[PDB]
């Protein structure tokens, strides 16, 4: 009711939101919390009335066998084991309703963080319309081709194309988290009449810390009907804990209202989201949208997850391989320089005679060799005077092992005047008083924000309670990044460091030879 | 002095051995522990006398700058940062000894678990004989070929072949830890006149828990001279903690004596060991042996580690891809069965008409369909009577979601009589009273132990102290494993489970149709 300016309180409310203990359940399925070994129903979603014709009053304190028939759930005397649970997934359960009616579910069990058994019953449309056993062969062929020859981009595209082929989703995206946990849509496959989100960048707050954390424990989220009105667990608290049941790993947990409102604003009728995890860190999501409601049965979700994770394993290997390959390319430059340096009369002469190697060593476009009295400028550099003032600035600030920046202007303001040749600077001190410098030009870089980063959500405060809402503007923002070079890669800096080392060895060997001899 | 029978006390002594706080240092290099910001020497290895001509009495309490000249170690006012440290690695330091002498080191710094700065000085033979910049190109080409077409075995071989090419080691092995942390030598490249360890299996105690733990924190261990007599840190305790310095991440930490004795027994003069880590778990080691002493400088070790880890990243992807590919092959079998099952008059007829699909579904060689009154035997099975007794045994033991074993004889002893067709059994209950069974024959499997598993080391007790020694027998043992089938793979069990599910759906759909109609 009261429009609240975006605050520190509204941001730390967002990052601490207890979404995992929400008690609201998506209305197409039943959640039953079960006390072992009898499988006594201790909580049940209130949609049991409409689905089963039996109220929570009729069901709480009954055993699961009194409510459902099944083939595979026997009465056993101790708590269900992890292996037992995973083999129950999914299992057919059915109830006889009104009189002349089967209602058939596929049930999926898990034990939550506090040891409570949770059973989730999704309607079984036996096997009605979404095969993937055959589509697995097309997905496998696609992966096989990538493994023959591919860029990283080809892997991204295969994930989105094959998940969309298998599922029939109107839109499938690959969403990658960056260093600040902003998101980038790095691949997309969608209907031709839908607008592209490919290349769009989103604030960290769109998928906040509790949502990201959830995806580390729970690989898959599905919402088959965004407009489904959520129903409560009854009671809202678990009888044995007296507290809300932890639904981190729940299929049928209804999403936090603000995310639902976000999807509704976007015209999304159904979604499927699968996480890609590396070394316990959330790397990204396969994010699928449909414009209308859409059921994705458990086996199909698991097939998409299996394929996506096998492709992702191949993406890690591809990233590591490209890094190695680039290091090897740079090692050639290093080796040629060391060969010519130690062969020349004077080692600076060796360097100057091989400028494409010297520049190639760090992926750069200009360089300066400053040794003793001489200053040699190679490739595209600032003019001699500017380099001298820059050298002087580097000398006056306590000599690190290396200085590098991809936007020199914002720590050295006079660099605005040579932004077209040296927005980027890599400076290595050699024997204290000397320097090798490498230079890179401005490259304009555009961040295509999918919403306003400075107005990333909406907050209201009623009765002391802060409420948070998705942003109401659909405008796009492009941030045009200027005075910035391409970034320095770790292997380029290491290659530069390796040249420094080789020069230092030369100087020491020459000092040792003019002592001994 | 007193021969001690191998015990629980000697085994838990082995698993709790504090190797990381050993104060003995390999004699070719110096260790200095340094107090910041002055870099005051608080401990030093006692070989400083011979290497520098200066005793610990002369050095303790001096700053590093009083002892060594360098280009890159400046006096700075706060503790060295992680980025500063890693750029110092390696840095040239040199001392002037006797009078007319340089002694030159490459120094490598780290901050240990307790915040102490440790500097390790290995002699610099500038760049004297072991290039790898060029060999990186051959290693890269080898990796490139694997990525075009390869089995897992090809990846193992590339690691050992290229590390050996780059290093010149007499023997290079890939050592993989199994589920019990026994080791298997799964690849090897060695001089033709040396005996092969390829295919040998070793007890967990050969590389005990403290050694494995060390490799999670410290990727590389090197011992350039196994016969080098280790020298103490002086003092043996750090002045600021009053306790032994944690040398987990130390290059020059001398190995525990029993491992040295092991290497000496094996004729090893030098070693290099690089760990391969996945998801915080130690997967395996690249283990290199030379028959004589051998220096492997820091940069070469890091090059081997980088290559080995890039190949290992590709090995994870290959393992995931082969698993996926096998699941897809099995999914074809599943799909054909479901198609023929739902098309036949009766679904058992569908199964029986496609026996290569039914067997192929689980990688098995025989099967039994037991539904209601009929029992159909497919492929190589036990005789009808034996299958009936087995069915009866399965019925009497509370029905899991699945029973599988790769050695039926050791829980069902009468299975010894049909070991050639059903050493392995996969049994799935369907609708409670029915079963699908799959059968597999005995396949003899040999474990080539590299030493006696029942006498895996030697223990003595003198004066209350238990001492442990490497085993003294060089005999090999082969364990010939009998009455055992090939193991059931997870994807084969899942495929069988998927058939069960499909049959259950059929039965429910037929029960629903004969109710409604
Ligand atoms: C409202 C308070 C704020 C908010 C909160 C919020 N977000 C989520 C979860 C997700 N948000 C997304 C984001 C996107 N999906 C997309 O397709 C795109 C376009 C490329 C975006 C930006 C996604 C994928 C999730 C994961 C959940 C899912 O089912 O996919 C949570 C999670 C809530 C839950 O209960 O599970 C919350 C609380 N989001 C906003 O818009 C506001 C800033
Ligand atoms: C003596 C008490 C027991 C023992 C202890 C022990 N072992 C190690 C470390 C290693 N052992 C090996 C084992 C092998 N290397 C090989 O090439 C082969 C043949 C294939 C084997 C079996 C290896 C590779 C290591 C790692 C250390 C390394 O430098 O390579 C430790 C570690 C000690 C340390 O201080 O670092 C200890 C205490 N080993 C025995 O033989 C006895 C059972
Ligand atoms: Na019942
Ligand atoms: Na962009
Ligand atoms: Na000095
Ligand atoms: Na063997």
Curated annotation (Swiss-Prot), chains A, B:
Its EC number is 2.7.13.3
Domain PAS residue range list: 18-85
Q: Quote the PTM field.
A: Contains one covalently linked tetrapyrrole chromophore.
Binding residues annotated for a tetrapyrrole, in chain numbering: 258
Any single biological process term in GO: response to red or far red light
- Region (Chromophore binding domain) location: 86-509
Q: Mind listing the UniProt keywords for this protein, alphabetically?
A: ATP-binding, Chromophore, Kinase, Nucleotide-binding, Phosphoprotein, Photoreceptor protein, Receptor, Sensory transduction, Transferase
What residues does the GAF domain cover?
151-319
Please name the GO terms that the record assigns under molecular function. ATP binding; identical protein binding; phosphorelay sensor kinase activity; protein histidine kinase activity; red or far-red light photoreceptor activity
Per its UniProt entry, what is the enzyme's top EC class, as one word?
Answer: transferase
Reactions it catalyzes: ATP + protein L-histidine = ADP + protein N-phospho-L-histidine
Answer whether the UniProt record assigns the keyword Kinase to this protein.
yes
What function does this protein fulfil? Regulatory photoreceptor which exists in two forms that are reversibly interconvertible by light: the R form that absorbs maximally in the red region of the spectrum and the FR form that absorbs maximally in the far-red region. Also has a slight blue shift for the far-red maximum. Forms a two-component system with the Rrcp1 response regulator.
Subunit structure as annotated in this protein's UniProt entry: Homodimer.
Q: Which family does it belong to?
A: In the N-terminal section; belongs to the phytochrome family.
An additional note in the Swiss-Prot or TrEMBL entry is:
The R form exhibits both ATP-dependent autophosphorylation and phosphotransfer to Rcp1 activities. Unlike the higher plants where Pfr is thought to be the active form.
Write the protein's name.
Phytochrome-like protein Cph1
Natural source organism: Synechocystis sp. (strain ATCC 27184 / PCC 6803 / Kazusa)
At the highest ranks, the source species' classification is: Bacteria, Bacillati, Cyanobacteriota, Cyanophyceae, Synechococcales
